[PDB]
């Protein structure tokens, strides 16, 4: 129920109904969907008005992205049970040496999962690099062991179409981070070692969670950057004319926009007394 002034009714209701139908649409990104960006009122209205409309559209879009909120707890507990699975598979495996394999399973088994949103990435990266080091030790393949050079994340001993399926699923989740596509084709292969198959399913789940994490963070920093620069340009342009209306809209606009909670409070403060600061807004 976002409200602003300066446009007709039909394009506004079309855009706010498109926003509700956003998460069921593929490749959703505002830089990838420029049809919204031509509806802001370029070369049509006054200057403070078009900054106002651009800021409200982008901030409502960011509220809609927080309203979508793609789930990750299911793949988190799935990664935890697959971590326990590959730990129990690497318990009984006879390695080339017991020492460093024992150290790597000791790294892997303690990191079950994490609580908040920040701690997941580094623990899933450490669990994944320990997992692929144990995988390369089980097949006795070589690995980079020079100091300061971490073994990169890669699938081990599979067909080319399967790893290409992994990369196209990576592309499909980097395009749409809201639809979950777990284990599309069969990666459980009886022709290889069951430890290698379990660690390949584990590294698929790790690739999925790091992909959705990176796509989510890049979308929110793009949205936050453009609403930041909209706030700076608006507090530039409104300040040239000293008036009570400009004082009130500035005092709304003083709040920070670094967080979803902060941007939410600033959006509801934009909504709740829109009739107060509307008097200094011309209409063409």
């Amino acid at each position: 129920s976002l409200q602003f002034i300066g446009l007709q009714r039909r394009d506004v209701v079309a855009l706010v109904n498109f926003l509700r139908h956003l998460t069921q649409k593929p490749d959703v990104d505002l830089e990838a969907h420029p049809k919204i960006l031509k509806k802001c009122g370029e070369k049509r209205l006054h200057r403070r008005t078009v900054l106002f409309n651009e800021l409200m559209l982008w901030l409502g879009y960011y509220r809609e992205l927080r309203f979508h909120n793609p789930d990750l707890s299911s793949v988190l507990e799935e990664f935890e049970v697959r971590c326990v699975a590959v730990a129990r598979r690497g318990y009984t495996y006879p390695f080339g040496d017991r020492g460093k394999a024992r150290d790597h399973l000791a790294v892997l088994d303690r990191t079950e999962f994490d609580t908040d949103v920040r701690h997941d990435a580094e623990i899933v990266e450490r669990a994944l690099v320990s997992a692929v080091i144990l995988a390369k030790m089980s097949v006795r393949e070589t690995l980079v062991t020079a100091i300061g050079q971490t073994e990169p994340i890669a699938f081990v001993h599979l067909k080319d179409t399967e790893v290409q399926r992994i990369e196209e699923n990576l592309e499909g989740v980097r395009r749409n981070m809201f639809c979950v596509k777990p284990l599309d084709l069969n990666l459980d292969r009886h022709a290889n070692t069951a430890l290698v198959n379990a660690v390949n399913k584990l590294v698929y789940t790790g690739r999925l969670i790091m992909n959705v994490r990176r796509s989510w963070e890049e979308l929110e920093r793009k949205c936050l950057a453009r609403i930041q620069e909209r706030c700076k340009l608006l507090v530039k342009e409104l300040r040239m004319c000293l008036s009570f209306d400009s004082n009130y809209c500035r005092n709304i606009l003083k709040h920070a926009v670094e967080n979803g909670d902060s941007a939410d409070t600033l959006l509801e403060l934009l909504i709740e007394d829109f009739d107060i600061y509307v008097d200094s807004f011309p209409q063409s």
Partner: protein, 49 residues
């Protein structure tokens, strides 16, 4: 109060704006209206000094 104010959502505050629930919540411990600006570590150390 008896419950510590760990969650961030229970504190919020506007400034320079007509917010009569904030003014009506004088000497009320539960919302804890706090400013937007966070203290960095160096000014925290200088305050402690």
């Amino acid at each position: 109060d008896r419950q510590p104010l760990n969650p961030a959502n229970i504190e919020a505050r506007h400034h320079g704006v007509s917010d009569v629930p904030r003014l009506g919540a004088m000497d009320a411990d539960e919302p804890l209206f706090v400013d937007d600006y966070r203290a960095t570590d160096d000014e925290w150390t200088l305050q402690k000094v």
